Amino acid sequence: IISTHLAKLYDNLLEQNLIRVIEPFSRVQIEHISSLIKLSKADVERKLSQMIL
Amino acid sequence: GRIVKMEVDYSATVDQRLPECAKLAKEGRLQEVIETLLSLEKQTRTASDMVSTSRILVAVVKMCYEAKEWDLLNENIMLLSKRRSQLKQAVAKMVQQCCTYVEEITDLPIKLRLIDTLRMVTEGKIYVEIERARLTKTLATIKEQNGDVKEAASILQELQVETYGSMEKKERVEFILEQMRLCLAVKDYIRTQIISKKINTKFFQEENTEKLKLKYYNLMIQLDQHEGSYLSICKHYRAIYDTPCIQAESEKWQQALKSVVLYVILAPFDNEQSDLVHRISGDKKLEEIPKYKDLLKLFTTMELMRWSTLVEDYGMELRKGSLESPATDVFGSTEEGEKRWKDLKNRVVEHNIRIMAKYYTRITMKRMAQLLDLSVDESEAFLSNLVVNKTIFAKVDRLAGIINFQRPKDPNNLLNDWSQKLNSLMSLVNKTTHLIAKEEMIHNLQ
Amino acid sequence: DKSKLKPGTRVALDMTTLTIMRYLPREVDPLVYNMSHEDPGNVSYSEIGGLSEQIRELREVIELPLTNPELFQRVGIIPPKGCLLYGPPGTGKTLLARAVA
Ligand SMILES: Nc1ncnc2c1ncn2[C@@H]1O[C@H](COP(=O)(O)OP(=O)(O)OP(=O)(O)O)[C@@H](O)[C@H]1O
């Protein structure tokens, strides 16, 4: 059952980690967000798009 | 307790008896001396003779000593402790004499028979009569095997203060703290804190405390130093710094100050430290060392520091100096000292960033790195750490390399400040006129 | 002073224009006063014979908890509050009570 809930937790944690990286500054290149987040540019862009709405 | 009418004194009967039993034991009649005595005391017990019971009780204990009947000593110790409740103080004296036996006799079987006396008192037939005797007795077991993981358990099982209350305060503090040193050896740090809090309940017992408490409370300068505590350890060194008022050794006092000022700086900024640094500064005893101006570098001129200059001007605090005693320990080590080198740089970088915030509205990222003495990428990493922790306000527009330290002015704050400007202006006008009357309208009339 | 006039404090008031003019200590009912200054007998423990174990038991809930309270804080028990001295009509009950009195 714990393995069943890992997917949700990864989604939840990914949300928090993005805020922790975007709080420190204002308008910022998406590339640097990927480097600090350690994730590809494609998914990070879309993830931000869903977050903003 | 109960005063029985004086009819016959039983001391004389045993007076001519106990020495007689000695002769029989000396020849080799170890048994015959033994069983005869118990019948002797039993009669006294019915009469409940404190003095009579005590004197006879030790004799059997005393006799077995010289008799070298270790096997018969233990069996004899138990039988004399649970016969008819004995006399409460009667057993008290017996353990005392037996107590001196363990401290003096070497060889392994001491521990084997040592526990026998521990159980005889254990926590039954105990208290003011045989309470404190137990405390030392378990201490001997503590030094029995010099201190190990298992010993720490052998001493924690004794709940000091709460149970051993009716015993000397000065000795209590020793026992309560001694087990703390046992905790550090095993490296159990969570337990060390909790046990530590039980001694600080009372202070100011330094009447004859040349090293009893103040200098023996150094452990907290070791326990607290483990994880991250700097300000807490700083307050401790000052605490012993009152000892120089008591122990004003020239070298000892000098090293303490170097330590007090050393990682007072190390602690991060906080209102608690701000007034602590002021108190440390300004003493009439800090000028004896060059370190005074280092600490003064965190107070005046707002000290936009250059870590390059700080290291080159103060490389003595890592190798040698006037005494450099704390310097070798604080920074001269391999690992523990080295960590405090990075931490100092963080504090020095923290001071530069905070101060530049007060006097800056917008600083380009590139020039920020030069002042901070780190790469631009590193400067962003440190800035983000501070901003995320709600310490310094800063919003960085990395697309243009400009970071501004100004909170977006609110409509009410912009106007509210204008309100406060008028109030001061109105008050000054009132003060200005009132100063004119003191001068223009006073001397003119003359 | 207007700081010792807390709720419940006894206060004397003037007869014509009711106004507090003095704060007073809590009153003692005259019955309670007569309930304390009573005993002239002065009976000693040596007069109540036969009851030896009983006296020791009764003194364990009147004298011991009121002289060495630190003993019972060791074990963790709270000393007993009450005590009922019953028995046949004519044994030592009031004599024992007057003894502690
Ligand atoms: N152990 C004793 N030693 C001396 N006198 C005793 C003893 N027991 C009883 N008495 C006698 O009992 C008499 C009355 O005792 P007390 O009034 O206390 O008993 P009680 O009838 O049980 O009490 P109460 O009715 O008030 O509850 C005393 O005058 C005393 O002489």
Ligand SMILES: [Mg+2]
């Ligand atoms: Mg009666």
